Amino acid sequence: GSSGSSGTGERHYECSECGKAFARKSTLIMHQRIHTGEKPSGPSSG
Ligand SMILES: [Zn+2]
């Protein structure tokens, strides 16, 4: 039925942005953030 390991379930989600493989799906999302942001600015301040 809907139960029974019958082996392993390696589910590594890679980042379509860089290509980094993670263990959890959500985790990857949090990472992708690094990409979207840090917009390019001329006058470096901070
Ligand atoms: Zn990435």
Side-chain angles (χ1 to χ4, degrees):
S2 53
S3 203
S5 295
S6 196
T8 54
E10 195 90 328
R11 281 178 298 200
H12 73 286
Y13 301 68
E14 209 151 302
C15 185
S16 200
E17 210 55 76
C18 55
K20 202 176 183 159
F22 300 82
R24 310 150 166 71
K25 169 75 181 181
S26 64
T27 294
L28 167 57
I29 286 80
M30 317 311 146
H31 152 93
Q32 289 184 313
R33 294 172 64 200
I34 79 181
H35 296 304
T36 182
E38 190 160 80
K39 289 155 200 72
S41 66
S44 57
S45 63

PDB file of all heavy atoms in Angstrom:
ATOM      1  N   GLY A   1       0.806  -1.206   0.000  1.00  0.00           N
ATOM      2  CA  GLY A   1       0.000   0.000   0.000  1.00  0.00           C
ATOM      3  C   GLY A   1       0.842   1.261   0.000  1.00  0.00           C
ATOM      4  O   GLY A   1       1.945   1.278  -0.545  1.00  0.00           O
ATOM      5  N   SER A   2       0.320   2.319   0.612  1.00  0.00           N
ATOM      6  CA  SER A   2       1.029   3.592   0.675  1.00  0.00           C
ATOM      7  C   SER A   2       2.007   3.611   1.847  1.00  0.00           C
ATOM      8  O   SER A   2       2.053   4.571   2.616  1.00  0.00           O
ATOM      9  CB  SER A   2       0.036   4.748   0.807  1.00  0.00           C
ATOM     10  OG  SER A   2      -0.851   4.537   1.892  1.00  0.00           O
ATOM     11  N   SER A   3       2.788   2.543   1.975  1.00  0.00           N
ATOM     12  CA  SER A   3       3.763   2.433   3.053  1.00  0.00           C
ATOM     13  C   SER A   3       4.764   1.316   2.771  1.00  0.00           C
ATOM     14  O   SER A   3       4.382   0.196   2.432  1.00  0.00           O
ATOM     15  CB  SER A   3       3.055   2.175   4.385  1.00  0.00           C
ATOM     16  OG  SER A   3       3.858   2.584   5.477  1.00  0.00           O
ATOM     17  N   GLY A   4       6.048   1.630   2.912  1.00  0.00           N
ATOM     18  CA  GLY A   4       7.084   0.644   2.668  1.00  0.00           C
ATOM     19  C   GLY A   4       8.323   1.249   2.040  1.00  0.00           C
ATOM     20  O   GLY A   4       8.347   1.528   0.841  1.00  0.00           O
ATOM     21  N   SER A   5       9.357   1.453   2.850  1.00  0.00           N
ATOM     22  CA  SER A   5      10.604   2.034   2.367  1.00  0.00           C
ATOM     23  C   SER A   5      11.033   1.386   1.055  1.00  0.00           C
ATOM     24  O   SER A   5      11.136   2.052   0.025  1.00  0.00           O
ATOM     25  CB  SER A   5      11.706   1.870   3.415  1.00  0.00           C
ATOM     26  OG  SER A   5      11.415   2.615   4.585  1.00  0.00           O
ATOM     27  N   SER A   6      11.281   0.081   1.101  1.00  0.00           N
ATOM     28  CA  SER A   6      11.703  -0.659  -0.083  1.00  0.00           C
ATOM     29  C   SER A   6      12.916   0.000  -0.732  1.00  0.00           C
ATOM     30  O   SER A   6      12.996   0.115  -1.954  1.00  0.00           O
ATOM     31  CB  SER A   6      10.556  -0.745  -1.092  1.00  0.00           C
ATOM     32  OG  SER A   6      10.802  -1.751  -2.060  1.00  0.00           O
ATOM     33  N   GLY A   7      13.862   0.432   0.098  1.00  0.00           N
ATOM     34  CA  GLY A   7      15.059   1.074  -0.411  1.00  0.00           C
ATOM     35  C   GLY A   7      15.261   2.463   0.162  1.00  0.00           C
ATOM     36  O   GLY A   7      15.028   2.693   1.349  1.00  0.00           O
ATOM     37  N   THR A   8      15.697   3.393  -0.683  1.00  0.00           N
ATOM     38  CA  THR A   8      15.933   4.765  -0.253  1.00  0.00           C
ATOM     39  C   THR A   8      15.197   5.756  -1.147  1.00  0.00           C
ATOM     40  O   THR A   8      14.781   5.417  -2.254  1.00  0.00           O
ATOM     41  CB  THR A   8      17.435   5.104  -0.258  1.00  0.00           C
ATOM     42  OG1 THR A   8      17.998   4.819  -1.544  1.00  0.00           O
ATOM     43  CG2 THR A   8      18.174   4.313   0.811  1.00  0.00           C
ATOM     44  N   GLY A   9      15.038   6.982  -0.659  1.00  0.00           N
ATOM     45  CA  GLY A   9      14.351   8.004  -1.428  1.00  0.00           C
ATOM     46  C   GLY A   9      15.148   9.289  -1.526  1.00  0.00           C
ATOM     47  O   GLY A   9      14.663  10.357  -1.154  1.00  0.00           O
ATOM     48  N   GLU A  10      16.376   9.187  -2.027  1.00  0.00           N
ATOM     49  CA  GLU A  10      17.242  10.351  -2.169  1.00  0.00           C
ATOM     50  C   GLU A  10      16.566  11.432  -3.008  1.00  0.00           C
ATOM     51  O   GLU A  10      16.390  11.276  -4.216  1.00  0.00           O
ATOM     52  CB  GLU A  10      18.571   9.950  -2.810  1.00  0.00           C
ATOM     53  CG  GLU A  10      19.658  11.002  -2.666  1.00  0.00           C
ATOM     54  CD  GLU A  10      20.474  10.829  -1.399  1.00  0.00           C
ATOM     55  OE1 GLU A  10      19.907  10.368  -0.386  1.00  0.00           O
ATOM     56  OE2 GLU A  10      21.679  11.155  -1.421  1.00  0.00           O
ATOM     57  N   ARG A  11      16.189  12.528  -2.357  1.00  0.00           N
ATOM     58  CA  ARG A  11      15.531  13.635  -3.042  1.00  0.00           C
ATOM     59  C   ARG A  11      16.338  14.921  -2.894  1.00  0.00           C
ATOM     60  O   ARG A  11      16.032  15.767  -2.052  1.00  0.00           O
ATOM     61  CB  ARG A  11      14.120  13.839  -2.487  1.00  0.00           C
ATOM     62  CG  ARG A  11      13.103  12.848  -3.029  1.00  0.00           C
ATOM     63  CD  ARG A  11      11.729  13.068  -2.416  1.00  0.00           C
ATOM     64  NE  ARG A  11      11.736  12.862  -0.969  1.00  0.00           N
ATOM     65  CZ  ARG A  11      10.642  12.621  -0.257  1.00  0.00           C
ATOM     66  NH1 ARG A  11       9.459  12.555  -0.853  1.00  0.00           N
ATOM     67  NH2 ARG A  11      10.730  12.444   1.057  1.00  0.00           N
ATOM     68  N   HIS A  12      17.371  15.064  -3.719  1.00  0.00           N
ATOM     69  CA  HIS A  12      18.222  16.248  -3.682  1.00  0.00           C
ATOM     70  C   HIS A  12      17.795  17.258  -4.743  1.00  0.00           C
ATOM     71  O   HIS A  12      17.920  17.004  -5.940  1.00  0.00           O
ATOM     72  CB  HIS A  12      19.685  15.857  -3.891  1.00  0.00           C
ATOM     73  CG  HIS A  12      20.002  15.457  -5.300  1.00  0.00           C
ATOM     74  ND1 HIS A  12      19.614  14.252  -5.846  1.00  0.00           N
ATOM     75  CD2 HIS A  12      20.672  16.113  -6.277  1.00  0.00           C
ATOM     76  CE1 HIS A  12      20.033  14.182  -7.096  1.00  0.00           C
ATOM     77  NE2 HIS A  12      20.679  15.299  -7.383  1.00  0.00           N
ATOM     78  N   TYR A  13      17.290  18.402  -4.294  1.00  0.00           N
ATOM     79  CA  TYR A  13      16.842  19.448  -5.205  1.00  0.00           C
ATOM     80  C   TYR A  13      17.978  20.415  -5.525  1.00  0.00           C
ATOM     81  O   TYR A  13      18.500  21.091  -4.639  1.00  0.00           O
ATOM     82  CB  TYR A  13      15.664  20.212  -4.598  1.00  0.00           C
ATOM     83  CG  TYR A  13      14.470  19.336  -4.291  1.00  0.00           C
ATOM     84  CD1 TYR A  13      14.525  18.380  -3.285  1.00  0.00           C
ATOM     85  CD2 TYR A  13      13.286  19.466  -5.006  1.00  0.00           C
ATOM     86  CE1 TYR A  13      13.437  17.578  -3.001  1.00  0.00           C
ATOM     87  CE2 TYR A  13      12.191  18.670  -4.727  1.00  0.00           C
ATOM     88  CZ  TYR A  13      12.272  17.727  -3.725  1.00  0.00           C
ATOM     89  OH  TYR A  13      11.185  16.930  -3.444  1.00  0.00           O
ATOM     90  N   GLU A  14      18.356  20.474  -6.799  1.00  0.00           N
ATOM     91  CA  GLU A  14      19.430  21.358  -7.236  1.00  0.00           C
ATOM     92  C   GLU A  14      18.887  22.737  -7.599  1.00  0.00           C
ATOM     93  O   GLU A  14      17.705  22.888  -7.914  1.00  0.00           O
ATOM     94  CB  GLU A  14      20.161  20.754  -8.436  1.00  0.00           C
ATOM     95  CG  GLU A  14      21.618  21.172  -8.536  1.00  0.00           C
ATOM     96  CD  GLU A  14      22.484  20.119  -9.201  1.00  0.00           C
ATOM     97  OE1 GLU A  14      22.527  18.980  -8.690  1.00  0.00           O
ATOM     98  OE2 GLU A  14      23.117  20.434 -10.230  1.00  0.00           O
ATOM     99  N   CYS A  15      19.756  23.741  -7.551  1.00  0.00           N
ATOM    100  CA  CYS A  15      19.365  25.107  -7.874  1.00  0.00           C
ATOM    101  C   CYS A  15      19.558  25.392  -9.360  1.00  0.00           C
ATOM    102  O   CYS A  15      20.677  25.346  -9.872  1.00  0.00           O
ATOM    103  CB  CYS A  15      20.177  26.102  -7.042  1.00  0.00           C
ATOM    104  SG  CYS A  15      19.663  27.838  -7.248  1.00  0.00           S
ATOM    105  N   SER A  16      18.459  25.688 -10.048  1.00  0.00           N
ATOM    106  CA  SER A  16      18.507  25.977 -11.476  1.00  0.00           C
ATOM    107  C   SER A  16      19.286  27.261 -11.745  1.00  0.00           C
ATOM    108  O   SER A  16      19.539  27.615 -12.896  1.00  0.00           O
ATOM    109  CB  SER A  16      17.090  26.100 -12.040  1.00  0.00           C
ATOM    110  OG  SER A  16      17.084  25.923 -13.446  1.00  0.00           O
ATOM    111  N   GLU A  17      19.663  27.953 -10.675  1.00  0.00           N
ATOM    112  CA  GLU A  17      20.413  29.197 -10.795  1.00  0.00           C
ATOM    113  C   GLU A  17      21.914  28.927 -10.822  1.00  0.00           C
ATOM    114  O   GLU A  17      22.612  29.327 -11.755  1.00  0.00           O
ATOM    115  CB  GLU A  17      20.074  30.137  -9.636  1.00  0.00           C
ATOM    116  CG  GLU A  17      20.185  31.610  -9.994  1.00  0.00           C
ATOM    117  CD  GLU A  17      19.355  31.978 -11.208  1.00  0.00           C
ATOM    118  OE1 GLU A  17      18.117  32.078 -11.072  1.00  0.00           O
ATOM    119  OE2 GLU A  17      19.941  32.167 -12.294  1.00  0.00           O
ATOM    120  N   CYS A  18      22.406  28.246  -9.793  1.00  0.00           N
ATOM    121  CA  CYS A  18      23.824  27.923  -9.696  1.00  0.00           C
ATOM    122  C   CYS A  18      24.062  26.437  -9.950  1.00  0.00           C
ATOM    123  O   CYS A  18      24.950  26.061 -10.714  1.00  0.00           O
ATOM    124  CB  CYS A  18      24.364  28.309  -8.318  1.00  0.00           C
ATOM    125  SG  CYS A  18      23.441  27.581  -6.927  1.00  0.00           S
ATOM    126  N   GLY A  19      23.260  25.596  -9.304  1.00  0.00           N
ATOM    127  CA  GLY A  19      23.398  24.162  -9.472  1.00  0.00           C
ATOM    128  C   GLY A  19      23.715  23.452  -8.171  1.00  0.00           C
ATOM    129  O   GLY A  19      24.151  22.301  -8.172  1.00  0.00           O
ATOM    130  N   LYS A  20      23.499  24.142  -7.055  1.00  0.00           N
ATOM    131  CA  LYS A  20      23.764  23.573  -5.740  1.00  0.00           C
ATOM    132  C   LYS A  20      22.673  22.583  -5.345  1.00  0.00           C
ATOM    133  O   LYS A  20      21.484  22.888  -5.434  1.00  0.00           O
ATOM    134  CB  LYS A  20      23.866  24.682  -4.692  1.00  0.00           C
ATOM    135  CG  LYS A  20      24.629  24.275  -3.443  1.00  0.00           C
ATOM    136  CD  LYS A  20      24.780  25.436  -2.477  1.00  0.00           C
ATOM    137  CE  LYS A  20      25.599  25.044  -1.257  1.00  0.00           C
ATOM    138  NZ  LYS A  20      26.177  26.233  -0.571  1.00  0.00           N
ATOM    139  N   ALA A  21      23.085  21.398  -4.906  1.00  0.00           N
ATOM    140  CA  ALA A  21      22.141  20.366  -4.493  1.00  0.00           C
ATOM    141  C   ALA A  21      21.867  20.441  -2.996  1.00  0.00           C
ATOM    142  O   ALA A  21      22.791  20.540  -2.188  1.00  0.00           O
ATOM    143  CB  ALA A  21      22.670  18.990  -4.867  1.00  0.00           C
ATOM    144  N   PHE A  22      20.590  20.394  -2.630  1.00  0.00           N
ATOM    145  CA  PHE A  22      20.192  20.457  -1.228  1.00  0.00           C
ATOM    146  C   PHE A  22      19.444  19.194  -0.817  1.00  0.00           C
ATOM    147  O   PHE A  22      19.112  18.355  -1.654  1.00  0.00           O
ATOM    148  CB  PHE A  22      19.316  21.687  -0.981  1.00  0.00           C
ATOM    149  CG  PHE A  22      19.998  22.985  -1.305  1.00  0.00           C
ATOM    150  CD1 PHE A  22      20.046  23.450  -2.609  1.00  0.00           C
ATOM    151  CD2 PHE A  22      20.590  23.740  -0.306  1.00  0.00           C
ATOM    152  CE1 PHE A  22      20.673  24.644  -2.911  1.00  0.00           C
ATOM    153  CE2 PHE A  22      21.219  24.935  -0.602  1.00  0.00           C
ATOM    154  CZ  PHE A  22      21.260  25.388  -1.905  1.00  0.00           C
ATOM    155  N   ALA A  23      19.182  19.064   0.480  1.00  0.00           N
ATOM    156  CA  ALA A  23      18.471  17.904   1.004  1.00  0.00           C
ATOM    157  C   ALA A  23      16.968  18.154   1.046  1.00  0.00           C
ATOM    158  O   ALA A  23      16.175  17.299   0.650  1.00  0.00           O
ATOM    159  CB  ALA A  23      18.989  17.550   2.389  1.00  0.00           C
ATOM    160  N   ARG A  24      16.582  19.330   1.529  1.00  0.00           N
ATOM    161  CA  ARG A  24      15.172  19.691   1.625  1.00  0.00           C
ATOM    162  C   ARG A  24      14.781  20.654   0.508  1.00  0.00           C
ATOM    163  O   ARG A  24      15.593  21.462   0.055  1.00  0.00           O
ATOM    164  CB  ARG A  24      14.878  20.325   2.985  1.00  0.00           C
ATOM    165  CG  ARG A  24      15.397  19.513   4.161  1.00  0.00           C
ATOM    166  CD  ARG A  24      15.762  20.405   5.337  1.00  0.00           C
ATOM    167  NE  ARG A  24      15.947  19.641   6.567  1.00  0.00           N
ATOM    168  CZ  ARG A  24      16.983  18.836   6.783  1.00  0.00           C
ATOM    169  NH1 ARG A  24      17.920  18.693   5.856  1.00  0.00           N
ATOM    170  NH2 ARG A  24      17.082  18.174   7.928  1.00  0.00           N
ATOM    171  N   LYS A  25      13.531  20.563   0.066  1.00  0.00           N
ATOM    172  CA  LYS A  25      13.030  21.426  -0.998  1.00  0.00           C
ATOM    173  C   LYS A  25      12.988  22.880  -0.543  1.00  0.00           C
ATOM    174  O   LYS A  25      13.560  23.760  -1.188  1.00  0.00           O
ATOM    175  CB  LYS A  25      11.634  20.975  -1.432  1.00  0.00           C
ATOM    176  CG  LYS A  25      10.934  21.963  -2.349  1.00  0.00           C
ATOM    177  CD  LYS A  25      11.514  21.929  -3.753  1.00  0.00           C
ATOM    178  CE  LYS A  25      10.832  22.940  -4.663  1.00  0.00           C
ATOM    179  NZ  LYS A  25      11.381  22.901  -6.046  1.00  0.00           N
ATOM    180  N   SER A  26      12.307  23.128   0.572  1.00  0.00           N
ATOM    181  CA  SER A  26      12.188  24.478   1.111  1.00  0.00           C
ATOM    182  C   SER A  26      13.559  25.134   1.238  1.00  0.00           C
ATOM    183  O   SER A  26      13.751  26.284   0.836  1.00  0.00           O
ATOM    184  CB  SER A  26      11.497  24.445   2.476  1.00  0.00           C
ATOM    185  OG  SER A  26      12.272  23.730   3.423  1.00  0.00           O
ATOM    186  N   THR A  27      14.512  24.397   1.800  1.00  0.00           N
ATOM    187  CA  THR A  27      15.865  24.907   1.982  1.00  0.00           C
ATOM    188  C   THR A  27      16.370  25.592   0.717  1.00  0.00           C
ATOM    189  O   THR A  27      16.803  26.744   0.754  1.00  0.00           O
ATOM    190  CB  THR A  27      16.843  23.780   2.367  1.00  0.00           C
ATOM    191  OG1 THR A  27      16.506  23.259   3.657  1.00  0.00           O
ATOM    192  CG2 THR A  27      18.276  24.289   2.379  1.00  0.00           C
ATOM    193  N   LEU A  28      16.311  24.877  -0.400  1.00  0.00           N
ATOM    194  CA  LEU A  28      16.762  25.416  -1.679  1.00  0.00           C
ATOM    195  C   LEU A  28      16.180  26.806  -1.919  1.00  0.00           C
ATOM    196  O   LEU A  28      16.906  27.747  -2.238  1.00  0.00           O
ATOM    197  CB  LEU A  28      16.361  24.480  -2.820  1.00  0.00           C
ATOM    198  CG  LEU A  28      16.479  25.053  -4.232  1.00  0.00           C
ATOM    199  CD1 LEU A  28      17.902  25.518  -4.502  1.00  0.00           C
ATOM    200  CD2 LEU A  28      16.048  24.021  -5.265  1.00  0.00           C
ATOM    201  N   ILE A  29      14.866  26.927  -1.760  1.00  0.00           N
ATOM    202  CA  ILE A  29      14.188  28.202  -1.956  1.00  0.00           C
ATOM    203  C   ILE A  29      14.883  29.319  -1.185  1.00  0.00           C
ATOM    204  O   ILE A  29      15.229  30.355  -1.751  1.00  0.00           O
ATOM    205  CB  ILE A  29      12.714  28.130  -1.515  1.00  0.00           C
ATOM    206  CG1 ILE A  29      11.891  27.345  -2.538  1.00  0.00           C
ATOM    207  CG2 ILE A  29      12.147  29.529  -1.330  1.00  0.00           C
ATOM    208  CD1 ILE A  29      12.027  25.845  -2.402  1.00  0.00           C
ATOM    209  N   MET A  30      15.086  29.099   0.110  1.00  0.00           N
ATOM    210  CA  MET A  30      15.743  30.087   0.958  1.00  0.00           C
ATOM    211  C   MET A  30      17.097  30.486   0.380  1.00  0.00           C
ATOM    212  O   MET A  30      17.517  31.638   0.496  1.00  0.00           O
ATOM    213  CB  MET A  30      15.924  29.534   2.374  1.00  0.00           C
ATOM    214  CG  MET A  30      14.703  28.796   2.899  1.00  0.00           C
ATOM    215  SD  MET A  30      13.178  29.732   2.676  1.00  0.00           S
ATOM    216  CE  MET A  30      12.011  28.408   2.369  1.00  0.00           C
ATOM    217  N   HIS A  31      17.775  29.528  -0.244  1.00  0.00           N
ATOM    218  CA  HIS A  31      19.081  29.781  -0.841  1.00  0.00           C
ATOM    219  C   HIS A  31      18.949  30.647  -2.091  1.00  0.00           C
ATOM    220  O   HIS A  31      19.604  31.682  -2.210  1.00  0.00           O
ATOM    221  CB  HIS A  31      19.768  28.461  -1.193  1.00  0.00           C
ATOM    222  CG  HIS A  31      20.730  28.573  -2.337  1.00  0.00           C
ATOM    223  ND1 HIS A  31      22.076  28.817  -2.168  1.00  0.00           N
ATOM    224  CD2 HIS A  31      20.532  28.469  -3.672  1.00  0.00           C
ATOM    225  CE1 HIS A  31      22.665  28.862  -3.349  1.00  0.00           C
ATOM    226  NE2 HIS A  31      21.751  28.653  -4.279  1.00  0.00           N
ATOM    227  N   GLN A  32      18.099  30.216  -3.017  1.00  0.00           N
ATOM    228  CA  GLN A  32      17.882  30.952  -4.257  1.00  0.00           C
ATOM    229  C   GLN A  32      17.804  32.453  -3.992  1.00  0.00           C
ATOM    230  O   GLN A  32      18.141  33.263  -4.854  1.00  0.00           O
ATOM    231  CB  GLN A  32      16.600  30.475  -4.940  1.00  0.00           C
ATOM    232  CG  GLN A  32      16.713  29.085  -5.544  1.00  0.00           C
ATOM    233  CD  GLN A  32      15.466  28.674  -6.302  1.00  0.00           C
ATOM    234  OE1 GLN A  32      14.347  28.836  -5.812  1.00  0.00           O
ATOM    235  NE2 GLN A  32      15.651  28.139  -7.503  1.00  0.00           N
ATOM    236  N   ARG A  33      17.356  32.815  -2.794  1.00  0.00           N
ATOM    237  CA  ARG A  33      17.232  34.218  -2.417  1.00  0.00           C
ATOM    238  C   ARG A  33      18.537  34.966  -2.670  1.00  0.00           C
ATOM    239  O   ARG A  33      18.534  36.078  -3.199  1.00  0.00           O
ATOM    240  CB  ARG A  33      16.838  34.339  -0.944  1.00  0.00           C
ATOM    241  CG  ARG A  33      15.446  33.810  -0.640  1.00  0.00           C
ATOM    242  CD  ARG A  33      15.183  33.762   0.858  1.00  0.00           C
ATOM    243  NE  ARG A  33      15.196  35.093   1.459  1.00  0.00           N
ATOM    244  CZ  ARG A  33      15.370  35.311   2.758  1.00  0.00           C
ATOM    245  NH1 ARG A  33      15.546  34.291   3.587  1.00  0.00           N
ATOM    246  NH2 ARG A  33      15.369  36.551   3.229  1.00  0.00           N
ATOM    247  N   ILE A  34      19.650  34.349  -2.287  1.00  0.00           N
ATOM    248  CA  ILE A  34      20.962  34.957  -2.473  1.00  0.00           C
ATOM    249  C   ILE A  34      21.112  35.521  -3.881  1.00  0.00           C
ATOM    250  O   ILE A  34      21.745  36.559  -4.082  1.00  0.00           O
ATOM    251  CB  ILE A  34      22.094  33.944  -2.214  1.00  0.00           C
ATOM    252  CG1 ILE A  34      22.272  33.027  -3.425  1.00  0.00           C
ATOM    253  CG2 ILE A  34      21.799  33.129  -0.963  1.00  0.00           C
ATOM    254  CD1 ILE A  34      23.346  31.979  -3.236  1.00  0.00           C
ATOM    255  N   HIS A  35      20.524  34.833  -4.854  1.00  0.00           N
ATOM    256  CA  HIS A  35      20.590  35.267  -6.245  1.00  0.00           C
ATOM    257  C   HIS A  35      19.770  36.536  -6.458  1.00  0.00           C
ATOM    258  O   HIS A  35      20.303  37.576  -6.844  1.00  0.00           O
ATOM    259  CB  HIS A  35      20.089  34.159  -7.171  1.00  0.00           C
ATOM    260  CG  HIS A  35      20.934  32.923  -7.140  1.00  0.00           C
ATOM    261  ND1 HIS A  35      22.287  32.929  -7.405  1.00  0.00           N
ATOM    262  CD2 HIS A  35      20.611  31.637  -6.871  1.00  0.00           C
ATOM    263  CE1 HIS A  35      22.760  31.701  -7.302  1.00  0.00           C
ATOM    264  NE2 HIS A  35      21.763  30.896  -6.978  1.00  0.00           N
ATOM    265  N   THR A  36      18.468  36.442  -6.205  1.00  0.00           N
ATOM    266  CA  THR A  36      17.573  37.580  -6.371  1.00  0.00           C
ATOM    267  C   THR A  36      17.786  38.611  -5.269  1.00  0.00           C
ATOM    268  O   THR A  36      17.292  38.452  -4.153  1.00  0.00           O
ATOM    269  CB  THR A  36      16.097  37.139  -6.368  1.00  0.00           C
ATOM    270  OG1 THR A  36      15.247  38.271  -6.583  1.00  0.00           O
ATOM    271  CG2 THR A  36      15.735  36.468  -5.052  1.00  0.00           C
ATOM    272  N   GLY A  37      18.523  39.670  -5.590  1.00  0.00           N
ATOM    273  CA  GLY A  37      18.787  40.713  -4.615  1.00  0.00           C
ATOM    274  C   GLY A  37      20.144  41.359  -4.811  1.00  0.00           C
ATOM    275  O   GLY A  37      20.701  41.327  -5.908  1.00  0.00           O
ATOM    276  N   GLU A  38      20.676  41.950  -3.746  1.00  0.00           N
ATOM    277  CA  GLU A  38      21.975  42.609  -3.808  1.00  0.00           C
ATOM    278  C   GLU A  38      22.154  43.335  -5.138  1.00  0.00           C
ATOM    279  O   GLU A  38      23.228  43.298  -5.739  1.00  0.00           O
ATOM    280  CB  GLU A  38      23.099  41.589  -3.616  1.00  0.00           C
ATOM    281  CG  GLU A  38      24.470  42.220  -3.437  1.00  0.00           C
ATOM    282  CD  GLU A  38      25.462  41.283  -2.775  1.00  0.00           C
ATOM    283  OE1 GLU A  38      26.012  40.410  -3.479  1.00  0.00           O
ATOM    284  OE2 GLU A  38      25.688  41.423  -1.556  1.00  0.00           O
ATOM    285  N   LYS A  39      21.094  43.994  -5.592  1.00  0.00           N
ATOM    286  CA  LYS A  39      21.131  44.730  -6.851  1.00  0.00           C
ATOM    287  C   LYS A  39      22.433  45.514  -6.984  1.00  0.00           C
ATOM    288  O   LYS A  39      22.988  46.014  -6.005  1.00  0.00           O
ATOM    289  CB  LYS A  39      19.937  45.683  -6.944  1.00  0.00           C
ATOM    290  CG  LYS A  39      18.609  44.976  -7.143  1.00  0.00           C
ATOM    291  CD  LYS A  39      17.448  45.818  -6.641  1.00  0.00           C
ATOM    292  CE  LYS A  39      16.212  44.969  -6.387  1.00  0.00           C
ATOM    293  NZ  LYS A  39      16.367  44.111  -5.180  1.00  0.00           N
ATOM    294  N   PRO A  40      22.932  45.628  -8.224  1.00  0.00           N
ATOM    295  CA  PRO A  40      24.173  46.353  -8.514  1.00  0.00           C
ATOM    296  C   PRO A  40      24.021  47.859  -8.332  1.00  0.00           C
ATOM    297  O   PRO A  40      23.146  48.481  -8.932  1.00  0.00           O
ATOM    298  CB  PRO A  40      24.444  46.016  -9.983  1.00  0.00           C
ATOM    299  CG  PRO A  40      23.106  45.697 -10.552  1.00  0.00           C
ATOM    300  CD  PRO A  40      22.323  45.059  -9.438  1.00  0.00           C
ATOM    301  N   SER A  41      24.880  48.438  -7.498  1.00  0.00           N
ATOM    302  CA  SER A  41      24.839  49.872  -7.234  1.00  0.00           C
ATOM    303  C   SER A  41      26.183  50.521  -7.549  1.00  0.00           C
ATOM    304  O   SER A  41      27.236  49.913  -7.367  1.00  0.00           O
ATOM    305  CB  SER A  41      24.462  50.132  -5.774  1.00  0.00           C
ATOM    306  OG  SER A  41      25.468  49.656  -4.896  1.00  0.00           O
ATOM    307  N   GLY A  42      26.137  51.762  -8.024  1.00  0.00           N
ATOM    308  CA  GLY A  42      27.357  52.475  -8.357  1.00  0.00           C
ATOM    309  C   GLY A  42      28.135  52.899  -7.127  1.00  0.00           C
ATOM    310  O   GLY A  42      29.199  52.361  -6.822  1.00  0.00           O
ATOM    311  N   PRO A  43      27.600  53.889  -6.396  1.00  0.00           N
ATOM    312  CA  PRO A  43      28.235  54.408  -5.182  1.00  0.00           C
ATOM    313  C   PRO A  43      28.195  53.408  -4.032  1.00  0.00           C
ATOM    314  O   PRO A  43      27.226  53.356  -3.274  1.00  0.00           O
ATOM    315  CB  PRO A  43      27.397  55.644  -4.844  1.00  0.00           C
ATOM    316  CG  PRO A  43      26.065  55.378  -5.456  1.00  0.00           C
ATOM    317  CD  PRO A  43      26.334  54.577  -6.700  1.00  0.00           C
ATOM    318  N   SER A  44      29.253  52.612  -3.909  1.00  0.00           N
ATOM    319  CA  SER A  44      29.336  51.609  -2.854  1.00  0.00           C
ATOM    320  C   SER A  44      29.203  52.256  -1.478  1.00  0.00           C
ATOM    321  O   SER A  44      30.043  53.060  -1.074  1.00  0.00           O
ATOM    322  CB  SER A  44      30.660  50.850  -2.947  1.00  0.00           C
ATOM    323  OG  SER A  44      31.763  51.736  -2.870  1.00  0.00           O
ATOM    324  N   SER A  45      28.141  51.899  -0.763  1.00  0.00           N
ATOM    325  CA  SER A  45      27.894  52.447   0.565  1.00  0.00           C
ATOM    326  C   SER A  45      27.308  51.385   1.491  1.00  0.00           C
ATOM    327  O   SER A  45      26.216  50.870   1.250  1.00  0.00           O
ATOM    328  CB  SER A  45      26.946  53.644   0.479  1.00  0.00           C
ATOM    329  OG  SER A  45      25.675  53.253  -0.010  1.00  0.00           O
ATOM    330  N   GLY A  46      28.041  51.061   2.552  1.00  0.00           N
ATOM    331  CA  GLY A  46      27.578  50.063   3.497  1.00  0.00           C
ATOM    332  C   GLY A  46      28.636  49.020   3.804  1.00  0.00           C
ATOM    333  O   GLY A  46      29.775  49.389   4.091  1.00  0.00           O
TER     334      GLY A  46
HETATM  335 ZN    ZN B   1      21.577  28.953  -6.349  1.00  0.00          ZN
END
